[PDB]
Scaffold this motif. Structure first.
Motif, mmCIF file in Angstrom:
data_model
loop_
_atom_site.group_PDB
_atom_site.id
_atom_site.type_symbol
_atom_site.label_atom_id
_atom_site.label_comp_id
_atom_site.label_asym_id
_atom_site.label_seq_id
_atom_site.Cartn_x
_atom_site.Cartn_y
_atom_site.Cartn_z
ATOM 1 N N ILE A 1 0.821 -1.182 -0.010
ATOM 2 C CA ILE A 1 -0.105 0.131 -0.013
ATOM 3 C C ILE A 1 1.048 1.243 0.189
ATOM 4 O O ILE A 1 2.063 1.021 0.393
ATOM 5 C CB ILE A 1 -0.885 0.030 1.029
ATOM 6 N N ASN A 2 0.315 2.247 -0.371
ATOM 7 C CA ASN A 2 0.906 3.733 -0.380
ATOM 8 C C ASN A 2 0.252 4.772 0.627
ATOM 9 O O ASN A 2 1.194 5.692 1.083
ATOM 10 C CB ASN A 2 0.777 4.329 -1.714
ATOM 11 N N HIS A 7 1.085 7.790 7.252
ATOM 12 C CA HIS A 7 1.382 7.352 8.488
ATOM 13 C C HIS A 7 2.972 7.408 8.478
ATOM 14 O O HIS A 7 3.502 6.832 9.466
ATOM 15 C CB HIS A 7 0.649 6.301 9.109
ATOM 16 N N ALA A 8 3.636 7.737 7.429
ATOM 17 C CA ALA A 8 5.087 7.573 7.105
ATOM 18 C C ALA A 8 5.855 7.900 8.741
ATOM 19 O O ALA A 8 6.159 6.984 9.576
ATOM 20 C CB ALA A 8 5.532 8.486 6.229
#
Length: 11
Positions: A1-2, A7-8
């Motif tokens: 997913i990207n 939530h990086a």
């Protein structure tokens, strides 16, 4: 997913 980029920083 990207969507992780949404939530990086999250960690």
């Amino acid at each position: 997913i990207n969507y992780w980029l949404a939530h990086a920083k999250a960690g």
